[PDB]
């Protein structure tokens, strides 16, 4: 996720997201609120990382 938001690469994001989804089967929701703390506020230096999200 860190490398994906640094490079502004969506393929690695899709890998990470679906990996936590399979780890769940509310671990998705846990990881999503973990993102909301100091990841999803500013994914990249530019706030276009939210627009790519």
């Amino acid at each position: 996720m860190a490398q994906a938001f640094e490079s502004c690469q969506l393929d690695s994001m899709v890998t990470a997201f679906l990996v936590v989804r399979q780890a769940a089967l509310l671990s998705y929701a846990d990881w999503f609120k973990a993102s909301f703390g100091s990841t999803r506020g500013y994914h990249g230096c530019s706030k276009k990382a939210l627009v790519f999200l």
């Binding site: 500013y42 230096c45 530019s46």
Partner: protein, 142 residues
Amino acid sequence: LLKAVQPLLKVSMSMRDCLILVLRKAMFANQLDARKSAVAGFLLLLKNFKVLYNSVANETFCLEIMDSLRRCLSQQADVRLMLYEGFYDVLRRNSQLANSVMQTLLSQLKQFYEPKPDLLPPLKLEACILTQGDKISLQEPL
């Protein structure tokens, strides 16, 4: 002494291969004055040793010595300081080295500039500071 002499070294050349030789052998000195003698002979060779003999044997010779000054941009605080200050006159008297000199500096900026929005100290102040054996010196005055 050298502002006076240098009119020689535009004409004579054997003497100029004596000079940059001496300034270079001073850069790697014990005495603290010798580093700064090097800077000053080099900063002035870069200043009045062309605006931009052949132009190509000066635009290269300025980029030769200026690479030997990226050692001095590494050297201790005072000797750096003299380069921040003398390079403005090198720019006035030698305009075309602007592009090269900019990258020489802008590299030295980025060693202490963190270019991310939402990192609140934008600059690295604690890497300007050398602490060894409780002698805590600023070197690279930002």
